[PDB]
Amino acid sequence: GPSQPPYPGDDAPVEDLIRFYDNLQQYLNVVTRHRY
Amino acid sequence: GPSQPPYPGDDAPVEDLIRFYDNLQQYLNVVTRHRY
């Protein structure tokens, strides 16, 4: 939701990076009011 | 491309966060061979 998802370093495994992608997409869809 | 995009903290402004979203999407599309 309206919370910045945890970033486990740049060497984070792609699956958890995709996990971050999902959470970031959700976050952005919230904060940007789904304008994008 | 095949490089982990820079993350300027959790308080990063949403526009640069969207910028990170684009670069992360591109990165994931590369690393995952566009399987997702």
Experimental method: NMR
Chain B residues within 8 A of A31 when measuring between CB atoms: 14
What type of residue is B15? Answer: E
Q: Does B19 touch chain A (CB under 8 A)?
A: no
User: Does some domain include residue A3?
Assistant: no
Are B18 and A32 within 8 A, CB to CB?
yes
- Give the other-Cβ count within 10 Å of B33's Cβ: 7
Which residue is it, tokens 């820079």? B6
Q: How many domains does chain A have?
A: 1
Q: Does A28 touch chain B (CB under 8 A)?
A: yes
Q: Range of A31's domain?
A: 10-36
The answer to whether the beta carbons of residues A3 and B6 sit under 8 Å apart is: no
3-state helix, strand, coil in chain A (%, to 5): 50, 0, 50
DSSP annotation of B34: T
User: Does some domain include residue B35?
Assistant: yes
User: Measured between alpha carbons, how far is A14 from B34 in angstroms, rounded to an integer?
Assistant: 13
